[PDB]
């Protein structure tokens, strides 16, 4: 059986990230990272790119470039997961075993849970940033909208970006005053949630953004069907169980539900819900000792971000590096997440927040004005930084900077 | 192998569902997949946990509940091709239909738990919600002497939420009667933030607790069991990364729950797992000859047989329809009840729907706690359950409701 000291699934975000860490810890001969994608995103931009500022392109690396020199890619997909044995199944019925598991399997989108879909995408008018087969999709719905709702929806499944179903409402709204077409449109935010935004302070700030833009937002309102070719959506009251309505788009924004990756679901290392069952402060999984979790597919309770992902990184280097001297890791993760909420075309409301769902801003300025440095540093600064920084293993979230900008 | 009406899980739903669509194309085309032997009436086993009845009236043999002339394929469904109008078991055949009921119910996740259910090899710990460990939740109230008895509640959705609670009104009866009462240190540490979802009911418990001196933790999630020392690890919802170890004389554990694993992962579940069907008709969202019923449904109501009986109803309206290409005009309203069993003759009677507001059968306020609720939930609903619902002649008490007004 094929064998690795340290196996790392998924080779995004978080299982790039801790492979070059692990890499420097172990050695690289003795990393593998099981990945079925030849390319790799750097999703956040996708926000940018749905609403015309940026390239999709400039948004994908090839997975092999991003591989740290040295560590094995497996390019398989992860079809079972057997901890109990150490060992992993792949869909090149391949088995592997590993004496460490690294499990970054990300979240699932299920556009298909929506009646209509992926389908409806073939038609104009409906776009997602969510899937690189979408997003520009988003983009082109913004240019040829001409008049009537521009739809931007909320699923009711947790999320990774929380705050992307929004930020592309902003800057559509954005675009069409931009573009004089402002008067002809009615913005909608369909959302499953009861607030807009699960942090005081920003969700604040965002509610100004809603009144002063004349945004409409309907909570605990879901989408379920889409029919693209009459460019009708039905939603879902949640409040009303069984209550639904048709409206007309001019523009759909969707965001998919989105679920555990399949091959997590039904397996030994999920938590009852699916999620990777992981130490909410060690993230050294709490029933396979030598199992370890990052990012979008665990039970973290934070909201579910590449930022996220960076602090988390941080935090299970140590970890590991402390279980490998079989000793008890010490240094906690703190629910360290971020989302820069684009608010337009040049503006970014900073969110950052821990488990406590309070600000921990890094800052010293207050980041729930809208800000042109955040926005450039979302824009321009963060996707340099990850590139070069965090897959290469030298970004744990800006703890450190916080704490040197408070002196 | 093709069935017109392929039924998925041979219990109360599968069931219930099977006897109606017998009657209404005939059992020779009704086919039943089921692997369990026994089919099990499971609200008495809140009963057996308290001592007051007895596991093995609790159970049947699966053979003698398939209504006669429809098939009973004794497998488990491994995967759900809907597309392809067939599913596969793990006898790896494939079965067509031309409807599909999937009434598959929910999944225990005990292994969620670290130490269980190898924890329960040793004392002191029960849970209602498994034939393997309910005569073991009545052992740990008996062998109660002194200390904590914990009742948990998990994070997750749960068939009959009243359950875990039931057992620990029945405890406390029980301490009473026996007179360890000044021992034990009564604690229900549920995943969630109010007692109950309906207020009516929340507040007739809030009394009870308040006046038998009972313990609510709220947003505590049991995540270990270390039973051997005789610890139970809670996760605090509220502060994430705390927990809390508290040492138990006595622990009812309900389970984690999920979808089966076959749905979790297949076409006709919604993104969490559960079977998407529309609210109020129970036809799949997307799959328009898939039909669900019961506790593995994303049914926006409890999961509970009563919610099952009520769905059995409008789902033999909703598939007759469909079957005579007409559209569908009877609606679920989200029916549902918990008999709260608040003592060993007492029942608080919560019935509501899809508002969470009260849905009373009966003219009388039933957030009263009585004697003719408990009577009729120990010795009249295993009846109905076994010799009306289970053949296809109780759709829920709504007719009750309206000719007692
Ligand atoms: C539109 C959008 C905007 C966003 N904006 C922001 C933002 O502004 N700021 C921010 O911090 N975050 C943002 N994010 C979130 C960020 O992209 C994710 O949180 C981050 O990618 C999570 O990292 P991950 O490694 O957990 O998941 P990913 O980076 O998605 O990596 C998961 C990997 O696992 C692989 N995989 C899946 N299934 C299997 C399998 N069975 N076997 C093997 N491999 C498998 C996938 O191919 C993928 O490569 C945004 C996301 C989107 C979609
Ligand atoms: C302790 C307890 C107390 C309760 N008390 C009450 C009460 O007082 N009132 C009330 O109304 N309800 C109560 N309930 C709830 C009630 O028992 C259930 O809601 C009801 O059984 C739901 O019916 P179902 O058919 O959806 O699922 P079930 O009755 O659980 O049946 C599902 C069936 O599917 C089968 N199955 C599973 N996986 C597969 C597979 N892969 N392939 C094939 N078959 C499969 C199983 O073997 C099972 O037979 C209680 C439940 C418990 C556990
Ligand atoms: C229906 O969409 C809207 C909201 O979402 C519920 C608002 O919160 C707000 C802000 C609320 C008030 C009362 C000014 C406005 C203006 C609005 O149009
Ligand atoms: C691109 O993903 C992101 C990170 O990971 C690289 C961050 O650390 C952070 C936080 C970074 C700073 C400089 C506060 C943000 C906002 C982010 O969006
Ligand atoms: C540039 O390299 C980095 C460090 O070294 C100075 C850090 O300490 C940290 C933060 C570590 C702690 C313990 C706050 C990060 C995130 C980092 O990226
Ligand atoms: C066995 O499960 C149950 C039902 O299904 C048969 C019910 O219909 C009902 C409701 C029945 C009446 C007469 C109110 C209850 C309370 C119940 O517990
Ligand atoms: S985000
Ligand atoms: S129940």
Redesign the interface.
């Known amino acids: 059986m094929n064998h690795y000291e340290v196996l790392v699934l998924g080779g995004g975000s978080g299982g790039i990230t801790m492979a070059a860490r692990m890499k420097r810890k172990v050695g690289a001969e003795n990393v593998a990272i099981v990945e079925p994608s030849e390319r790799h995103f750097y999703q956040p931009i996708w926000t940018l790119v749905g609403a015309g500022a940026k390239q999709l392109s400039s948004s994908g690396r090839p997975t092999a470039s991003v591989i740290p020199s040295g560590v094995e890619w497996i390019k398989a997909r992860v079809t079972e997961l057997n901890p109990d044995k150490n060992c992993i199944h792949t869909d090149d019925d391949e088995k592997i075993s590993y004496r460490y598991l690294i499990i970054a399997l990300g979240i699932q989108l299920?556009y298909?849970?929506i009646?209509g879909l992926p389908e409806g995408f073939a038609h104009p008018k409906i776009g997602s940033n969510y899937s690189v087969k979408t997003v520009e999709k988003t983009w082109k719905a913004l240019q040829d909208f001409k008049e009537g709702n521009a739809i931007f929806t909320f699923?009711?499944?947790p999320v990774k970006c929380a705050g992307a179903p929004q930020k592309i409402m902003y800057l559509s709204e954005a675009y069409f005053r931009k573009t004089g077409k402002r008067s002809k449109a009615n913005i909608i935010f369909n959302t499953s949630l009861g607030a807009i935004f699960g942090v005081k302070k920003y969700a604040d700030a965002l509610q100004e953004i809603i009144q002063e833009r004349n945004l409409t937002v309907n909570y605990k309102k879901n989408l379920?069907?889409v029919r693209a070719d009459k460019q009708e959506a039905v939603f879902?009251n949640?409040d009303?169980?069984?209550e639904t309505q048709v409206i007309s788009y001019e523009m759909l924004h969707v965001t998919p539900?989105?679920?555990p990756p399949?091959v997590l679901?039904?397996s030994?290392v999920?938590?009852?819900?699916?999620w990777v069952?992981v130490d909410?402060?060690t993230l050294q999984h709490?029933?396979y000792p030598n199992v370890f979790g990052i990012g979008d597919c665990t039970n973290?309770?934070?909201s579910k971000t590449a930022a996220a992902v960076a602090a988390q990184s941080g935090i299970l280097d140590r970890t590991i590096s402390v279980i490998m001297k079989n000793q008890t890791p010490t240094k906690?993760?703190?629910?360290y997440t971020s989302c820069p909420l684009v608010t337009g075309y040049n503006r970014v409301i900073l969110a950052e927040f821990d488990?406590?769902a309070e600000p921990l801003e890094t800052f010293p300025f207050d980041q729930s004005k809208e800000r042109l440095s955040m926005y450039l540093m979302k824009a321009d600064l963060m996707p340099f930084l990850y590139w070069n920084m965090m897959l290469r293993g030298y970004w744990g979230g800006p703890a450190f900077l916080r704490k040197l900008f408070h002196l």
Do not use: H, Q, V
Not at 270 to 274: E, F, R, V
Not at 332 to 335: I, Q, R, T, V
């Open positions: 299920d298909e849970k009646k699923p009711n499944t379920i069907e879902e949640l009303k169980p069984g539900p989105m679920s399949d679901k039904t030994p999920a938590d009852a819900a699916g069952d909410k402060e709490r029933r973290l309770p934070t906690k993760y703190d629910g488990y406590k």
